[PDB]
Design a binder for these strands. Sequence first.
RNA 1: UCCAGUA
RNA 2: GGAACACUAUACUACUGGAUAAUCAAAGACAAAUCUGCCCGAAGGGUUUGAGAACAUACCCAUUGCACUCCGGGUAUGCAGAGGUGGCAGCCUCCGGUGGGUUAAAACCCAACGUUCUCAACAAUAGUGA
Length: 92
Amino acid sequence: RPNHTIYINNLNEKIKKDELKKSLHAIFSRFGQILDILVSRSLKMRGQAFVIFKEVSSATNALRSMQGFPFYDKPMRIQYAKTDSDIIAKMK
RNA sequence: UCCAGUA
RNA sequence: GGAACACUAUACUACUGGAUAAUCAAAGACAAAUCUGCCCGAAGGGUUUGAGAACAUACCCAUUGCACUCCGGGUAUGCAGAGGUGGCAGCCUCCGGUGGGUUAAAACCCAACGUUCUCAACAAUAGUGA
Ligand SMILES: [Mg+2]
Ligand SMILES: [Mg+2]
Ligand SMILES: [Mg+2]
Ligand SMILES: [Mg+2]
Ligand SMILES: [Mg+2]
Ligand SMILES: [Mg+2]
Ligand SMILES: [Mg+2]
Ligand SMILES: [Mg+2]
Ligand SMILES: [Mg+2]
Ligand SMILES: [Mg+2]
Ligand SMILES: [Mg+2]
Ligand SMILES: [Mg+2]
Ligand SMILES: [Mg+2]
Ligand SMILES: [Mg+2]
Ligand SMILES: [Mg+2]
Ligand SMILES: [Mg+2]
Ligand SMILES: [Mg+2]
Ligand SMILES: [Mg+2]
Ligand SMILES: [Mg+2]
Ligand SMILES: [Mg+2]
Ligand SMILES: [Mg+2]
Ligand SMILES: [Mg+2]
Ligand SMILES: [Mg+2]
Ligand SMILES: [Mg+2]
Ligand SMILES: [Mg+2]
């Protein structure tokens, strides 16, 4: 079910955290307000990202018209976050 | 190994 | 440069070039100034070396992983950041290589950024200066 935050994996793992962060914000902003965007390069969390929209509809729109996008030479695999983000839970 | 310049 | 005040000389360390006549030369940050706030100490001042750790950058092996506290293994690299007397924050200035503005081109201006911690060793000798 639809959720403010989207989960993206299959990201290029050779890309630095700073770079990936601005590059994600640049292609997703055109869909709505973005509270924050979580990115780690751990063993467990690499290749993936979380993008938090302020509106649930923005998430949905982004998921749909961006799925499979060639992001850094690698199709994106956007899906909904299985759980709500901290920023959102401690907000509403 | 020595010598100078520089720091 | 020469390491707990300052300068000089010596030892000594790094870069560059040279062979006793040792060329000529390149190169190069502690220059100016001594800031504001809070905090800690009995005392605020390291251009040394090393060992750990973390961090960053390259590749290599693994990894398709649903998180919101950093955090897989490995080889190689780091030897540029500086001054403002401890720490954190900020501000001022310098040095550096980037990105903009300005120019005919430079200046000049703007901005962001630059390896940290812990431990151990060393911080000499001569002269001079309070
Ligand atoms: Mg100097
Ligand atoms: Mg000297
Ligand atoms: Mg001296
Ligand atoms: Mg020495
Ligand atoms: Mg000259
Ligand atoms: Mg000087
Ligand atoms: Mg001096
Ligand atoms: Mg001075
Ligand atoms: Mg005091
Ligand atoms: Mg006191
Ligand atoms: Mg003293
Ligand atoms: Mg000093
Ligand atoms: Mg799982
Ligand atoms: Mg590693
Ligand atoms: Mg290493
Ligand atoms: Mg050395
Ligand atoms: Mg460096
Ligand atoms: Mg102070
Ligand atoms: Mg400071
Ligand atoms: Mg500059
Ligand atoms: Mg220009
Ligand atoms: Mg012009
Ligand atoms: Mg120019
Ligand atoms: Mg700085
Ligand atoms: Mg001494």
